[PDB]
Amino acid sequence: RPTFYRQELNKTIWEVPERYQNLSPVGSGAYGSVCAAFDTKTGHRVAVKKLSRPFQSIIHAKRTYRELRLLKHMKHENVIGLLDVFTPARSLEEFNDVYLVTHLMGADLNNIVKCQKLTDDHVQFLIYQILRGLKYIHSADIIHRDLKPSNLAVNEDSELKILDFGLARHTDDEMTGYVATRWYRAPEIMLNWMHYNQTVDIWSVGCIMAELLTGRTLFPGTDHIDQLKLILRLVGTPGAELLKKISSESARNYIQSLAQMPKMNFANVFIGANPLAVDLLEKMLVLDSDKRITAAQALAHAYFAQYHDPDDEPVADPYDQSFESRDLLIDEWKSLTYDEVISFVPPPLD
Ligand SMILES: C[S@](=O)c1ccc(-c2nc(-c3ccc(F)cc3)c(-c3ccncc3)[nH]2)cc1
Ligand SMILES: O=S(=O)(Nc1ccc2[nH]c(C3CCC3)nc2c1)c1ccccc1
């Protein structure tokens, strides 16, 4: 067991192995606290995340287990994975803190869009990387569910990774009621219209891509009703085929209660944009989740011809999500998490 040292930063207590030096706060929130640090063992700059109250409730405990299981699984250039995971606890009994370690990423798209638009060539590269990462995630039957600029980390050389994936599993219970994530959420997950699949994430990508090309939020709704209004203004009110598949009577009632909207010509809306980009946007921003383009299909779109390589767009090992259906106690989840900490094999430095 390594030598730990203690430190207070922004009122948060950090206890980490000595190999991690020069801890510097990069952000905090509900998810937890992140510090940038220097890993003296490897020479690499890293981000260290301390989980907030990992075992405060069953939901917290289950969420903690979930995140650790997810991060241990992710082995892809466009998805954050685990360099290390540690606790300062010496046994299960005193285990109440979890720290996660990944390669440091300078920024996110939330602040790369700054408040200006990108070039078409830059967008191509960023969206390509998002899609390549989503292909991998989707292949393991993992759905992000809350993809947005702030959870896409980017380097100074414009290399991109998805973070906070697979954790949008709150379901009903709000408490955490977060906002401004509705802007990128697919209609069917926000309003629980119809059966939802992996292409909930493609909708988000469509919204992100739109925003990078124009410098504007595509659908800046102030609530669920406003949000849907803004969406239907662009894509048009559901046709015959799609109305039939709406499982909710309330939703279906509401849609049909609204003044009918035509689908707009995207060439008009996205005026001046690369017509390959517009075409891809058309395929991404379709209400019918059965007809929305998939990650793998999006990668093969001609918009990405400069980057697409079917021999280097890998899929994921099988991921066991059976734990998700289980109703266990705090101490069970917490013990399952501890097991996962102990069994963590550091990835080879090469
Ligand atoms: C506010 S939004 O919900 C949100 C959620 C998580 C993060 C967020 N989580 C991490 C993060 C760090 C380490 C780790 F092991 C897992 C995740 C990072 C991170 C990773 C690498 N370099 C810089 C920062 N950012 C950021 C924003
Ligand atoms: O899960 S990871 O893929 N692990 C991993 C471990 C060691 C690595 N060293 C290198 C360099 C390329 C030659 C040396 N990439 C490496 C990748 C991963 C990648 C990025 C962030 C977190 C986790």
Numbering used by the authors: 5 to 354
Lines from the paper:
p38α, also known as MAPK14, is a ubiquitously expressed mitogen-activated protein kinase (MAPK) family member that has a key role in maintaining cellular homeostasis and tissue organization. The p38α structure is topologically similar to other MAPKs and consists of two lobes linked by a flexible hinge, with the junction between the two lobes forming the ATP binding site. The activation of p38α normally involves phosphorylation by the upstream kinases MKK3 and MKK6, but p38α can be also activated by non-canonical mechanisms that involve autophosphorylation. Here, we report the identification of p38α inhibitors referred to as NC-p38i, which efficiently inhibit the autophosphorylation of p38α while having a minor effect on the canonical p38α pathway.
To characterize at an atomic level the interaction between NC-p38i and non-phosphorylated p38α, we performed co-crystallization experiments with either compound NC-37 or NC-38 and with or without the ATP competitive inhibitor SB203580 or the slow hydrolyzable ATP analog ATP-γ-S. Both SB203580 and ATP-γ-S have been reported to bind to p38α facilitating its crystallization. As for p38α, we used a recombinant protein that contains the single point mutation C162S, which facilitates crystallization by reducing its aggregation. We obtained well-diffracting crystals for three complexes of p38α with NC-37 or NC-38, two in the absence of co-factors and one with SB203580 bound to the ATP binding site. Our crystal structures show that NC-p38i do not displace the inhibitor SB203580 bound to non-phosphorylated p38α, but were able to bind to the catalytic site region in crystals obtained with the non-hydrolysable ATP-γ-S analog and in the absence of SB203580. Furthermore, we have found that the side chain of Y35 does not participate in the recognition of NC-p38i molecules, and is oriented outside the ATP-binding region, in contrast to the orientation observed in complexes with SB203580 (Y35-in). In addition, we found that NC-p38i can also bind to two other regions near the catalytic site of p38α, the so-called hinge pocket and the allosteric pocket. This alternative binding mode was observed in crystals that either have SB203580 bound to the active site of p38α or were obtained in the presence of ATP-γ-S. Interestingly, we could not observe in the crystal structures of p38α bound to NC-p38i the hydrogen bond between T185 and D150, which was previously identified as crucial for p38α autophosphorylation. Therefore, it seems that the three binding sites of NC-p38i compounds interfere with the formation of this key interaction, which leads to the inhibition of p38α autophosphorylation but barely affect the canonical p38α signaling. All the solved structures were unphosphorylated, with the DFG motif at the beginning of the activation loop in the active conformation (DFG-in).
